[PDB]
Structures are given as structure tokens and as C-alpha cells.
């Protein structure tokens, strides 16, 4: 008698754990519409990535050594330099911040979450004063090396302030997965030893 | 063995019994106090 009713009291535990498991099923719902949000944003940036390993080492090598660079070019790396925290104006320091062996490997680890929303303020400004510039000289024929990084460089912004959207949808996220997952863990060992 | 459940489920009610029972305590003190004050006051009323 007792053990049926000690086997029962397992079960008003997987009873807390269900109306947890309830809670679990209220999601799914969150994440199919920030999937849906990542589908529209990232995709992008994972293209901007590979094209980044797409580049060839020459294309890039033979610009740096230019004696003058062109204005598209200047425009284009100026923003992307500001990421990199040597904000300048000036075409030796951008030189000086490509020549490095240690510039291959950077070109995707710039993240869309560590820009500041004046900075990025900034770079829509910048966007607003050319916005005939960035892609579409990239389509004329500009340089086959600014293309990837510049790809690259006009994204990253789509996600900033609007990844902002979603921090509070992957903060409740992150509370209902914790939750979730506990009392799923509590699933599993309640249907166990039951 | 249903009915062992049956008679886990009915003591559960017997449980929330005994805390209506612990909610009492509380009844016996509030008219003890107000019984004093009762045969502070009203006896006189009744002599008269």
C-alpha cells in the first residue's frame, strides 16, 4: 500500500514536472519564431563567412601595397576598421592594421553583439552619405578582395538593434530552457524509477 | 491495491483535515481572550 502511494508521490513529483512539461510545450512556439528570425538575418553572414575563406591571398596582398587606394575602397574599409577597435582615418593605419599575418584569422571571429549602438548609429549615417556605394560598386568591379569583406561589413548592423528584439525573447528563452530542462532531467529520473 | 491509492488519497484529505484542526488553536485563543473580556463586562448586565 505504502509503496503504490510512495510510487504515486514520485508521480505528483513528475505532476510539478508536468506542469512544467506544460510549460515546455508553451515553448517550441518562441523558438520556431526566433528560428524563423535567424533564417531571415544569419544566413547572410554565414554566406559574407565562407566568401571571407574565399579570398584569395593576392587580392588582398597586391591592394595593401597600393599607392593610392580608390575612394569606394576607402569608404568601405574605414566602417570595417572601426570594428576592429583602431578606429582611424588615415591609409597607413589600415596598412599597418592588414599587413599582419594575424588578419587572416579575424575575418569571421567579429561578432554582431559587441558593437555599440552609437557606433552603429554612426555606420548608418556613414550608409545614408553612401548609400550608393558598398554593394553596388562591389557588383561593378571595384576589386574582387573588397567584395567578400565588404559584404561582410554592410551586414552585422541588420542584426545590431534588432538582435536587441531578441534579447529579451532569449532571455525568457534561456529562463524556460533552465526550467525545461531541469524538470526534464526530473522526467527522466521520475519515469525511471517509477 | 486501487483502494490502498483510494486510502493514500482520503488520508491526503485527512491531512488538509488536520490543518483546518492546526487552524483551530488559533480559535480557542481569540475566544479565550474574548470570554475574558466577556466576564469582565457582561456579568454585572446579567446580576442586573
Not at 579570398?55 to 569606394?72: C, D, G, T, Y
Not at 576607402?74 to 582615418?89: D, F, P, Q, R, W
Not at 538593434?161 to 534579447?167: G, N, P, Q, T, Y
Request: glycine share 2%.
Amino acid at each position: 500500500v505504502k509503496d503504490q502511494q510512495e510510487a504515486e508521490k514520485k508521480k505528483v513529483m513528475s505532476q510539478e514536472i508536468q506542469e512544467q512539461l506544460h510549460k515546455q510545450q508553451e515553448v517550441i512556439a518562441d523558438k520556431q519564431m526566433s528560428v524563423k528570425e535567424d533564417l531571415d538575418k544569419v544566413e547572410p553572414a554565414v554566406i559574407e563567412a565562407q566568401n571571407a575563406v574565399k579570398s584569395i591571398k593576392k587580392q588582398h596582398l597586391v591592394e595593401v601595397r597600393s599607392m593610392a587606394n580608390p575612394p569606394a575602397a576607402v569608404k568601405l574599409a574605414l566602417e570595417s576598421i572601426c570594428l576592429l577597435l583602431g578606429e582611424s582615418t588615415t591609409d597607413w593605419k589600415q596598412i599597418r592594421s592588414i599587413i599582419m599575418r594575424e588578419n587572416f584569422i579575424p575575418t569571421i571571429v567579429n561578432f554582431s553583439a559587441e558593437e555599440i549602438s552609437d557606433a552603429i548609429r554612426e555606420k548608418m549615417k556613414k550608409n545614408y552619405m553612401s548609400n550608393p556605394s558598398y554593394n553596388y560598386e562591389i557588383v561593378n568591379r571595384a576589386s574582387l578582395a573588397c567584395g567578400p569583406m565588404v559584404k561582410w561589413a554592410i551586414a552585422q548592423l541588420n542584426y545590431a538593434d534588432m538582435l536587441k528584439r531578441v534579447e529579451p525573447l532569449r532571455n525568457e528563452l534561456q529562463k524556460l530552457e533552465d526550467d525545461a530542462k531541469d524538470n526534464q532531467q526530473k522526467a527522466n529520473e521520475v519515469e525511471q524509477m517509477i
